[PDB]
Amino acid sequence: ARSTNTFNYATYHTLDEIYDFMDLLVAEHPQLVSKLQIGRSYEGRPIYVLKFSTGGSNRPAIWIDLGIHSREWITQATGVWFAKKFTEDYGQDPSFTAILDSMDIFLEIVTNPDGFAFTHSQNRLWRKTRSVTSSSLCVGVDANRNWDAGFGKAGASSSPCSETYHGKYANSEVEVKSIVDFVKDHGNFKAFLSIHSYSQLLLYPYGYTTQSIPDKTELNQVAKSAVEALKSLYGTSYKYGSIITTIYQASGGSIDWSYNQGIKYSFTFELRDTGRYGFLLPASQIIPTAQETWLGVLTIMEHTLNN
Ligand SMILES: [Zn+2]
Fold first, then answer.
1. Where are the alpha helices (DSSP H) in the chain?
2. Number of domains comprising the chain
3. Which one is catalytic: 108, 173, 270, 292?
4. Based on CB atoms within 10 Å of each CB, which residue in 86, 130, 176, 178 is the most buried?
């Protein structure tokens, strides 16, 4: 792709193609987008965040991360589509324009670059990082069980070979600490969205405790509105609720952490499908998935700008 306009959004890409895409986008919209390097992965790959902004100084912001579980390919694909969409819609869509005129958006397309490279090179179903454990032959940590939110509690595994291993200590994974430091240093995030696949769920905190969050009525109503919006395009049906009541107890998750940091609008999306294809969703479903997910995300951003 020589332009973001010639990039093929209807196919799955490699890490290099995605990183090149970032530079194309910055080159084409220098006034709206910038590429920030917030760290380096365990295997030394740069960890990039795209910042979308119309100006100001430390405007209230929205965090969006995709690909923390490497095999959920639909999420990185949706992330590239979102990046392009932001640049297309600014000045076109009255609602989205209103959002960018007052808030900044930080997008992390490939949150776990080492696992992603591995899914292309050796094992398509790899979901963890690629950090090497001391007293183990097993590699990697489930980065969505490594956050300081009920870390090590039930709903995570203490065995290194487990697909749900939580890691040695909270924030042991550089991929997670890089986000933690950035968000804490910024201090003006209002929303935190983490995108995964699959199951068609929109969840709010918590997963590590049965305790109800103080903002449950509001987040529940936002979730209902977001799922109604998403369903509107293709009729895709999502369920919504707190993590623990919807799925099961799960500790060390990112939205439990972000909520505990005071970022009220903390939600996780589990994208298509419900099991027919699971992690190997056909390339043909990339654009429709991205399109409907954008409506759900925009709904949350609108509430955020207003509240
Ligand atoms: Zn996931």
1. 15-28, 73-89, 94-102, 113-121, 174-186, 216-234, 243-246, 254-260, 286-306
2. 1
3. 270
4. 176
